[PDB]
């Protein structure tokens, strides 16, 4: 529960996620709350791939 | 105007591992990500690992226990360090940017059997 | 355990339109595989062409081109031109790993 408040809070604070993969891994965190870790660290790399579009975009 | 320069040893053969360090220029290693991948003669492209702005690291996991790879934010230097080197790791290695754009201009490594 | 497949050679001339393919083997790509393709030329040079499915890495000549189209990544050169001729690769991410394809050999006749 809080592991999974947390988990919430990460996500929606990782500022390059579009809302389609924000809501892709809300929704994976309510499935599967035992998996919050693993989702917690693929959130940040699509959040770290995101940065790089931006970049390129630039 | 990104330049990535790799320097360093490669192998060192009195222990058995490969060292490089790719120097960046062009954008802050604070920010973007850089890759490691490698080359064989007879291969394709195999990618080794990662390290992000933040330095989160992600390895290929088949190679993870025998690779560091670490950065200096202020020397915009990153190192890849590979460990137990056998002849199978015969390589041309790369440092990359974050989506291939950009490619250092590779360390040549040869293992003997 | 993601296998990434290309084409293994096509053949254009210079003014044509050719489209590579980068296939993934878990199904379809889509924006979170940020699919990426660059150029080898002899000598083993690297070029990035395109990162994240269908952005222009700076520098890179405009007829080149990313998307996706059906279930796979795309690369369009739209007026081939002789110099084009090299070997492309495709990579694609997976939740934690980049895989490459095997390279498309593009010859460029005439």
């Known amino acids: 529960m809080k592991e999974q408040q947390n988990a919430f809070y990460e996500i929606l604070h990782l500022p390059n996620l579009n809302e389609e993969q924000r809501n892709a891994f809300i929704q994976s965190l309510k499935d599967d709350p035992s998996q919050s870790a693993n989702l917690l660290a693929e959130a940040k790399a699509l959040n770290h791939l995101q940065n790089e579009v931006a970049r390129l975009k630039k | 105007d990104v330049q990535l320069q790799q320097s360093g040893p490669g192998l060192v053969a009195p222990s058995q591992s490969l060292s490089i360090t790719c120097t960046v220029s062009?954008?802050?290693?604070?920010?973007?990500?850089v890759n490691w991948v490698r080359q064989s003669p007879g291969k394709g492209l195999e990618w080794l690992g990662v390290?992000?702005?933040?330095?989160?690291?992600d390895y290929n996991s088949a190679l993870k226990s025998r690779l560091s790879v670490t950065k200096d934010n202020s020397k915009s230097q990153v190192f890849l360090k590979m460990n137990s080197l056998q002849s199978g790791d015969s390589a041309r290695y790369y440092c990359?940017?974050?989506?291939?754009?950009?490619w250092g201009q590779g360390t040549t490594l040869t293992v003997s059997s | 355990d993601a296998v990434v497949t290309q084409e293994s050679a096509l053949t254009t001339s210079p003014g044509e339109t050719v489209t590579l393919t980068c296939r993934s083997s878990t199904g379809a790509v889509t924006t979170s595989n940020y699919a990426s393709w660059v150029q080898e030329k002899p000598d083993h040079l690297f070029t990035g062409l395109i990162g994240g499915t269908n952005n222009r890495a700076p520098g890179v000549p405009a007829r080149f081109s990313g998307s996706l189209i059906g279930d796979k990544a795309a690369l369009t050169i739209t007026g081939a031109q002789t110099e084009d001729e090299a070997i492309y690769f495709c990579?694609?991410?997976?939740?934690?790993?980049?895989?490459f394809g095997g390279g498309t050999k593009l010859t460029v006749l005439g």
């Open positions: 062009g954008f802050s290693l604070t920010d973007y990500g």
């Open positions: 990359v940017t974050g989506l291939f754009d950009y």
């Open positions: 990579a694609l991410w997976y939740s934690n790993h980049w895989v």
């Open positions: 390290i992000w702005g933040d330095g989160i690291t």
